[PDB]
Amino acid sequence: SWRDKSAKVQVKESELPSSIPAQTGLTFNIWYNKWSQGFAGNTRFVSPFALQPQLHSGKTRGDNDGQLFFCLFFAKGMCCLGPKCEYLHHIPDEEDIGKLALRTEVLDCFGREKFADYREDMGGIGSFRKKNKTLYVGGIDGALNSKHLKPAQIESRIRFVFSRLGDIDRIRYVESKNCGFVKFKYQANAEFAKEAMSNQTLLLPSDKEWDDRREGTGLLVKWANEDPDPAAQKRLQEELKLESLNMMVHLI
Amino acid sequence: EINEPPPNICEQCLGDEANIRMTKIPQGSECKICTLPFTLYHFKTSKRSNNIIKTLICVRCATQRNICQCCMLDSRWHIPIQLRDHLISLVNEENVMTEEAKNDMMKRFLSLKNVKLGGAQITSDPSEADNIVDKLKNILLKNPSTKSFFLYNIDASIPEWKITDTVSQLLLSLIVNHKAKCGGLRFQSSELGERFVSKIIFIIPWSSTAENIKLSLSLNKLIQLEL
Amino acid sequence: DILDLEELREYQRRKRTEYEGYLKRNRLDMGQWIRYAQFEIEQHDMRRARSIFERALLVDSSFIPLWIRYIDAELKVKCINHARNLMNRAISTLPRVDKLWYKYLIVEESLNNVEIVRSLYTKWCSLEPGVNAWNSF
Amino acid sequence: LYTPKAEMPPEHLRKIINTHSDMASKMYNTDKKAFLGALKYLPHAILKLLENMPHPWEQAKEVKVLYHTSGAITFVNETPRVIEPVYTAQWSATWIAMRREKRDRTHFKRMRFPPFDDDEPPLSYEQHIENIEPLDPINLPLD
Amino acid sequence: FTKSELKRRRKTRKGDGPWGSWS
Amino acid sequence: PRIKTRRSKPAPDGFEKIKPTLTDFEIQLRDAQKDKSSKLAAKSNEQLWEIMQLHHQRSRYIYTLYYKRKAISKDLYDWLIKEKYADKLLIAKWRKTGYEKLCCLRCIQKNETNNGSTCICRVPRAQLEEEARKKGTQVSFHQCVHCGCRGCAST
Amino acid sequence: HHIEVVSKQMDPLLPRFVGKKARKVVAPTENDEVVPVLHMDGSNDRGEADPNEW
Amino acid sequence: LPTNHNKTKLLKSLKNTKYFQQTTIDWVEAGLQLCRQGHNMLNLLIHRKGLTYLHLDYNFNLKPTKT
Ligand SMILES: [Zn+2]
Ligand SMILES: [Zn+2]
Ligand SMILES: [Zn+2]
Ligand SMILES: [Zn+2]
Ligand SMILES: [Zn+2]
Ligand SMILES: [Zn+2]
Known part of the structure; x- marks a missing residue:
């Protein structure tokens, strides 16, 4: 278990990467940390690190404290503070979700405030106005360096990746749209994965493009608008009703 | 302007201490709703609690929604x-929404208006709240060691977490597609599979009016495959 | 030309942007307001039309024709209570103009709410109006 | 309930300044805002620094200094005060020393201006200057 | 509290002087 | 340690014993001063604390030499103070009862602290433990922000 | 329930009021109460003969 | 005639807060540190404005990089 052992360091701050990405332009902008005098070509790239959770997850300063938030850099798999980190280092569970359930309405499991609206992409941390648990998973074409895999193969690999990080409500790959819709058990979990597999690789050691994983462009894990499909809409409605019955009985 | 309205914070949130010491930064942030300066209040719930609680939204916004x-x-x-x-x-009506305008200018404007939104009009006056509550209340009343199964007859609404937890109670991996319902369950060992089976909407073969069920499965499966 | 839904949405947006822009310069061109409101009516989104009318009203109350147009728009979609409420409000604002009162009266007459027309007439007469009001009554 | 400020270890300040040369993270994002804010008071700081210019008889003048925890500004808090007649005496001595120097020296090398080139940055006080010892100041030798 | 208890317990800190580890 | 001028009175006799000890400290400080480009925030603060703790240790050494050990002469001590090998104020605090141990001066300014009160490091560890037990939790902190102070060790 | 409010003094470098940024904001009128505009006259002879001149 | 009521100086005001500390630094050190500080300030301001094409030289002699 995670609770059996202390959390290992993801990567030592020597191994950590600098804040000077890619020279996308002609000159560096000090107050922005971005580049400038040229926006030729796309910015995004593939994460060097990944949350290998059983090899990494463990105790922290936080697990002593009762810090209610998980380490963004743990999710990214690059936390340079291992056991000395205040933010936690393990997969969110019912106990921890339950623990922070008050605050998590307003903000993420990464302890950062949600907003009125989704960022037009549905790309950034979720809005407070929706309690979404469903991540859109674009850029699979890019995430596998143009590997002509089977849809079954794709969906299975996706399953392997996101099931590892959180309890699944459902997943469904769409051949016609080349993307995923990865509904989660909890919003905290959803948040965690959404960072934990942002800019990651779907590739594996068994695959031949393993050393070219860095060179492509990573998974585009964003948030999902609810489907137009009335097949699931009805289900959603039913769920809402059920939940409402719970709370309403709880009021008295 | 003058600090005329007081902050609108609830109890649960704030924590069970007789006296906390919070701070107020006036004109201290744009809110999370209406992009508009307001007096940001914040406090650690306990002294040694690490998480500060900061007042996300503005007081006008709070009043408007009638919220914390x-x-x-x-x-x-x-x-x-x-x-x-x-x-x-649901109770007393058919339609009560609280539409926030997702355009940065209009949201400000909306926030400025001293007018309660749909649900807020009910919950403000406690009498009406009580009435709503009572109305709501009224409304209420054979083991070959396969380690790998293929489960069928899966309710469309059921989630994988429910399944796996149920299995745990009766005790790993799991694959489900709600289109096909070809619940490609797989156990971490064959001995575990044996244990499970020996312990036994649970239609369960062990591949590696049931007729009509098979047909329904069939068509659905086919459709899934075409997708 | 205007085939699918989303395309219609885009059209609506673009048109709005035009109309909105023209309102921005001349906050007062009630012809422009009422035209815009007509557009809203045409689109069959009533709420937006109402909003437009309200804004227009705010910009210039004294322009009676605007009031009349709003009223009649309300009547159009058989949203009679809204028309009535509005007309009452118009009366409250500008009682000393007659055409509003007459508009109200005809509305009620067509409605065949004869008692209410008597009652209102009593009110109007009580305010020492023009002789015309009395005669019509 | 008051107490004076902490005479901190100047090493701390030095470290802070070193840190805020390679500034390019979301770490010290608000410190950049701090720097911007400090432009208000930079002329004041300049004035103070020029106020405590070490006079030409002071070899290596120390001074007390206030500094932002993020090293966005470095004031020269001490006011440079002097016993007036004593001060005059010192300047007089330097006047005569300088004059003497002028007398004796056949040529007098002036400093080239500006001292450093645009490529050459502001060299660190610890790495270059703090090691090497300063030359003897100007003061006529007294009986 | 006994002052010998504080004497034994201030050597449990794995570091010396002001910075102690205290596990 | 400042820079040797004409106005510097040279070090008296017994300095030759101590030079190499505080030399080490100086060297450490030099090591502790450079762009160790810690992208991280907490670690960056850690470096700063390394300088702070080092300063404390150096000053603490001289204090020990003067007062506890009772070895070095008074004149020498005075000279050291003047040159600022050891912080005088800190020493003074140390001499005073209650602060026998004291990380640094910044941890006992009630003005600087938002709550009008000293650094939590000044709370004796035992007290904190007691508090935690009463509450249910454990020691929430491990070192304050102003300096690397895992307890300030009044006791 | 009872609580102590405080104003923490902030660094006099960072902006005093982080919030305020010169927003353009449209005002809602909030004329929720209606108010009459109420003139007493009825001119026919001079009121109709005049417009031909005016 | 200097006005007397304003007896809250700038340095005094700054001293009052926590965010400043004080040290005994060599005047040359103060200078160099203040050049470094000033340089960082001005560059921060310029970059903030967006115009990264104005290169500050370390000698505070501003000039544009590109045409
Ligand atoms: Zn961490
Ligand atoms: Zn609350
Ligand atoms: Zn707001
Ligand atoms: Zn300290
Ligand atoms: Zn401390
Ligand atoms: Zn301390």
């Missing part, structure tokens, strides 16, 4: 605003 300024929940019932609006829509 830190929780974003109704100050009465401590529940999500959308959810409470749904509840209100």
